[PDB]
Amino acid sequence: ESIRMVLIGPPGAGKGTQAPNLQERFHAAHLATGDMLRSQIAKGTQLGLEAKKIMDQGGLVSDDIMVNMIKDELTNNPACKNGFILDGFPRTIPQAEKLDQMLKEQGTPLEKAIELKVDDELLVARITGRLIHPASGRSYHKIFNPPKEDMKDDVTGEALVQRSDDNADALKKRLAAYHAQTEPIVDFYKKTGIWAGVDASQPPATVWADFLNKLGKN
Ligand SMILES: Nc1ncnc2c1ncn2[C@@H]1O[C@H](COP(=O)(O)OP(=O)(O)OP(=O)(O)OP(=O)(O)OP(=O)(O)OC[C@H]2O[C@@H](n3cnc4c(N)ncnc43)[C@H](O)[C@@H]2O)[C@@H](O)[C@H]1O
């Protein structure tokens, strides 16, 4: 029950929705670079204030920053000994190449790169209806996956918010960047044989079952 894997998917595909499933199953560190950035933002740090502007425009934060963030976490974070789930990294070919390098040196290569495949049309409704609990990252959807207490993080009472980069202006820039910059990474992993595609247009439980199936564990 150990995994070192990457999650690749467009904005809205369902990475943050499935990761908890993977965490519980494999007890791996969930390293979501979007969550790390948002953490910077909330501490009011300088890196956070600069990342915030770019994120809100549907831009990508620079590779150097993102590689250093991940290198430190792989290195100093003890929870990353059991294995890890990279969520949102790598996001560009250079990050992919540098990650490859890093893991060679550490002698812990990636086992799986799961692509969550889902058409762009669907992704707009998903991003438009999303509410997150900002003090965790718990995502809900107004239509597709409602809080019972509306606008309230059901299990823990706290208030739900919209993400600032979930504006359909940012969203268009987010998708174009995914196709232009991130999608090429999929071929990289196809060529090393650790890629598996998952149908992320299905509902959550059906996607997770497909996941297990694809990991070759369940
Ligand atoms: N490495 C890096 N390099 C450079 N810049 C970087 C970077 N990492 C981060 N950044 C930057 O930070 C920004 C944000 O990154 P990040 O936060 O990683 O966002 P993202 O990749 O754009 O992804 P999302 O979080 O929007 O999607 P998701 O697939 O996790 O969705 P969710 O599960 O919530 O689900 C979406 C919604 O749909 C719902 N839903 C989920 N699954 C289903 C289902 N199967 N059916 C129906 N409803 C569903 C949910 O309930 C929810 O409402 C980047 O754009 C860039 O600026």
Curated annotation (Swiss-Prot):
GO cellular component terms, semicolon-separated: cytoplasm; cytosol; mitochondrial intermembrane space; mitochondrion
> So which domain of life are we looking at?
Eukaryota
Coiled-coil annotation reads none
UniProt keyword annotations, A-Z: Acetylation, ATP-binding, Cytoplasm, Kinase, Mitochondrion, Nucleotide-binding, Transferase
Where it mainly occurs, coarsely classed, is: cytoplasm
Does Kinase show up as a keyword for this record? yes
| Record localization | Cytoplasm, Cytosol; Mitochondrion intermembrane space
Question: Which residues are recorded as binding AMP?
Answer: T33, R38, G59, L60, V61, G88, F89, P90, R91, Q95, R163, R174
Q: What range does the record give for the signal peptide?
A: none
InterPro entries from the entry? Adenyl_kin_sub (IPR006259), Adenylat/UMP-CMP_kin (IPR000850), Adenylat_kinase_CS (IPR033690), Adenylate_kinase_lid-dom (IPR007862), AK2 (IPR028587), P-loop_NTPase (IPR027417)
Note on file?
Present with 123000 molecules/cell in log phase SD medium.
Q: Which PANTHER family match?
A: NUCLEOTIDE KINASE
Q: Which family does it belong to?
A: Belongs to the adenylate kinase family. AK2 subfamily.
Oligomer status and interactors:
Monomer.
What domain comment accompanies this record? Consists of three domains, a large central CORE domain and two small peripheral domains, NMPbind and LID, which undergo movements during catalysis. The LID domain closes over the site of phosphoryl transfer upon ATP binding. Assembling and dissambling the active center during each catalytic cycle provides an effective means to prevent ATP hydrolysis.
Q: What is this protein called?
A: Adenylate kinase
User: Encoded by which gene?
Assistant: ADK1
